[PDB]
Design a protein around this ligand. Sequence first.
Ligand SMILES: [Zn+2]
Length: 46
Amino acid sequence: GSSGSSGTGERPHKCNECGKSFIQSAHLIQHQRIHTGEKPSGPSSG
Ligand SMILES: [Zn+2]
């Protein structure tokens, strides 16, 4: 059991991709991007 992000000082917003955290949502909503980029090659229509 690797305890991570356990202690004092937490945020109401956390990334579901890696697990990071941010004070404001706008901060996270933007970060999550680093995980999902643009792939116009994929077959997925649209
Ligand atoms: Zn992340």
